[PDB]
Structure formats: structure tokens, C-alpha cells
Design a protein around this nucleic acid. Structure first.
Lengths: 118, 118, 130
DNA sequence: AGAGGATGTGGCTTC
DNA sequence: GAAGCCACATCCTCT
């Protein structure tokens, strides 16, 4: 993990980790780029293998029956709260719309390079 | 249904639950019944609030009187009333001049609403 | 029964009214979920139309107001003070003829007001009821 | 594929 | 501890 995205997002062990914070944590872990990754455009990402992301989310939240169908519902709840938005027309592509730069302390360009995103 | 007197001698209203979940459809359609004669088509409105929330957000708080009955279709309380506190309803029948009938400690709205002990 | 027998007593006795006789803090309740800019234009333009939504913050008692007698003029002021707006609106609150009076900062969207009994309206009303 | 409504649940905090 | 606030987890109906 290049940086402590989880902690920089607000996660401190106290209230259980939130779905957006968890995704952030996968986006900053080189070993997960195989199923989830930044698209290279700002804070936009694409879940290349939703079922996998779902399983992890499930295991991490101790909810064995968790599936993408249910997780995507979680994501849609962020639309109004302006944490994450959907990239219209692009399958499984979403985008953080909050101020990750202030939180993480890095600009997208910087983080992408740090993670050797291509 | 079973009506109940309001703070005005000219209006009655159906019975609301004592505690309900916010933004949740009510168990019984809310109604405002007029004793005296109110011309059909007259608009009736409802508002709510208290020392903890001066003006609660509602949904579908407008109804038209017909045969002395203002039948509200799907009235919901969105705003909360505070721990152990209830809302004071203010019913307004738009005649000329406008007639308004209140109803204190009418209902308690919370994020969860009635929940079986854990 | 549009009104109550002791139409006058209720106002000078009952705690509901007495609590609203004195200068209580009032506030515009319209479009709470909208930018402050939109709440400002909406509120002013609405007064020009003779209506608004006010609630006595302290007690949280909301009221719908119609600024007309039982395109206004003496009921909705705008001159009395650059910025403020003085409103007047009669009604039959809980079987008691009364008149709402208060002002509102066109920018703060709040101010003060109160409910003073209405000898005349009460009179007539108690006549129709005989 | 994706949006959004309805309602139950366990983590946690405040009264 | 009850009673609040939260963030989902589940299930669905619709396009």
C-alpha cells in the first residue's frame, strides 16, 4: 500500500469501515489492480471484476452472501451524499467526487504515478 | 375511520401513530374533516415543528377538501422531532379568511421509528 | 362551529395564545432545502403575491399566512424600513379570530411577530353563529 | 446494467 | 439500558 488511504479517509478502527473507504483501500494497493483500478482520469475508477470486489467487501464486513448486486446498491446511495458518482455509459465505472486530494494529500496525477497506473 | 378532535372547533382529523419512521408511508391515510361547511375544492395543508425543529420537512402535505373531507394521499414526515419529543401539527384550510387548526404532541418521528428491543 | 363561544376569553386566558401575544422570534419556513439565494427571492416574490410561511421558532408553531383582508397594500409593507418587510394577515386560529403581525429581514429571512386578538372579525363571526 | 423505493439489522453514541 | 443516528444489506420493480 503506497499510502494509508483507509486512515486518510476517516477510518480509524472505530466505526466499521465504510464502503467508499474500503474501495479507496483497494485502489491504493498494487496487488488489487487486477480487479479494481483507476481509469487514469481524475478520481475515476472501474471495477474490472465486480464479483471479486464484492467478495472482498463481503469478507471484510463479515457478510458472506455479499454480491455486486448488493454492493452497487451501496454505491448508488452515495449519489445524493456526493461521495461517489457513476460514469454514465461505462460499465462498472464510478468516480469519487468528494475531495480525495485534501484527504489523501495527493493529486490524482501523483497517486496514479505512485501506483504505476497504466 | 376513527376521527379525533383538533384544537379548532370546526375541524377533526384521523388518528396518526404516536411514533413513526421518517419518510415512511403512514399506516392509515391522514384525513382532515370539517364540522361546519367548507366549499369543495378548498385546499388544506399541513405543517409540523417544535422547539427542536421549527419546521419539519414533509411530503405530499397538500390536499383538496371534498364533501367535507381532505384526504391526504401518502403524507410522510421527513424531518425528525427529537428524542422523546413530538411534533405540533398545524392544519390550514384555505377559506377566506384562512382557517387553521393545530394539534399538539401529534406524532414522534425518528430515523428508525418503532423497533423491537435488541 | 367556525369559532368558539368564549372567542375572547380563549385569547386572554389559554396559554397557547398568551405564548404568542408577546414579541416572539419568527422565521420563514419555506424551501428549507434550497440555497439561501433561492430562499430569498422565493420569499420576497411570494410576499408580493400576498403569501408566506412563518413559524415561531421558540415554540416551533408553523402558520400559513395570507396577507389580505377578511396584490395587497397595507398588509404587506416594504417601505417602513429599507430591507425589512412588515406583514399582516388575519385568520381564525383555533376558533378565535386573530391577526398575525410581524416583520422579516429580506436577507436573514427571519425577524419577529405576534398574534393580537381581532375585536371586529370576532364580532361578525360570532354573529353568523348567533 | 443501472436507478431508486421499502424496510430490517447490527455498530455506536447520547440521554 | 433505551432510544437515537448511521450505513448499509436485502429484496425488488422498472426501464
Amino acid at each position: 500500500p503506497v499510502i494509508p488511504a483507509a486512515a486518510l479517509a476517516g477510518y480509524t478502527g472505530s466505526p466499521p469501515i465504510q464502503l467508499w473507504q474500503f474501495l479507496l483501500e483497494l485502489l491504493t494497493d498494487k496487488s488489487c489492480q487486477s480487479f479494481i483500478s483507476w481509469t487514469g482520469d481524475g478520481w475515476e475508477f472501474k471495477l474490472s471484476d465486480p464479483d471479486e470486489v464484492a467478495r472482498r467487501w463481503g469478507k471484510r464486513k463479515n457478510k458472506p452472501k455479499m454480491n455486486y448486486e448488493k454492493l452497487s446498491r451501496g454505491l448508488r446511495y452515495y449519489y445524493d451524499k456526493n461521495i461517489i458518482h457513476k460514469t454514465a455509459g461505462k460499465r462498472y465505472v464510478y468516480r469519487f467526487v468528494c475531495d480525495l486530494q485534501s484527504l489523501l494529500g495527493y493529486t490524482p496525477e501523483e497517486l496514479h504515478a505512485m501506483l504505476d497506473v497504466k | 375511520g376513527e376521527l379525533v378532535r383538533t384544537d379548532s372547533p370546526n375541524f377533526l382529523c384521523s388518528v396518526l401513530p404516536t411514533h413513526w419512521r421518517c419518510n415512511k408511508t403512514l399506516p392509515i391515510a391522514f384525513k382532515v374533516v370539517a364540522k361546519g361547511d367548507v366549499p369543495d375544492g378548498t385546499l388544506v395543508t399541513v405543517m409540523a415543528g417544535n422547539d427542536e425543529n421549527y419546521s419539519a420537512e414533509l411530503r405530499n402535505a397538500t390536499a383538496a377538501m371534498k364533501n367535507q373531507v381532505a384526504r391526504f394521499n401518502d403524507l410522510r414526515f421527513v424531518g425528525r422531532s427529537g428524542r422523546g419529543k413530538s411534533f405540533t401539527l398545524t392544519i390550514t384550510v384555505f377559506t377566506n379568511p384562512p382557517q387553521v387548526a393545530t394539534y399538539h404532541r401529534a406524532i414522534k418521528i425518528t430515523v428508525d421509528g418503532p423497533r423491537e428491543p435488541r | 362551529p367556525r369559532v368558539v363561544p368564549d372567542q375572547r376569553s380563549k385569547f386572554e386566558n389559554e396559554e397557547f395564545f398568551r405564548k404568542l401575544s408577546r414579541e416572539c422570534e419568527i422565521k420563514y419556513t419555506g424551501f428549507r432545502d434550497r440555497p439561501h439565494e433561492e430562499r430569498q427571492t422565493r420569499f420576497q416574490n411570494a410576499c408580493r403575491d400576498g403569501r408566506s410561511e412563518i413559524a415561531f421558532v421558540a415554540t416551533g408553531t408553523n402558520l400559513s399566512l395570507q396577507f389580505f383582508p377578511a396584490p395587497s397594500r397595507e398588509y404587506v409593507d416594504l417601505e417602513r424600513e429599507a430591507g425589512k418587510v412588515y406583514l399582516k394577515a388575519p385568520m381564525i386560529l383555533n376558533g378565535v379570530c386573530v391577526i398575525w403581525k410581524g416583520w422579516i429581514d429580506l436577507h436573514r429571512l427571519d425577524g419577529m411577530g405576534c398574534l393580537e386578538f381581532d375585536e371586529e372579525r370576532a364580532q361578525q363571526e360570532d354573529a353568523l353563529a348567533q
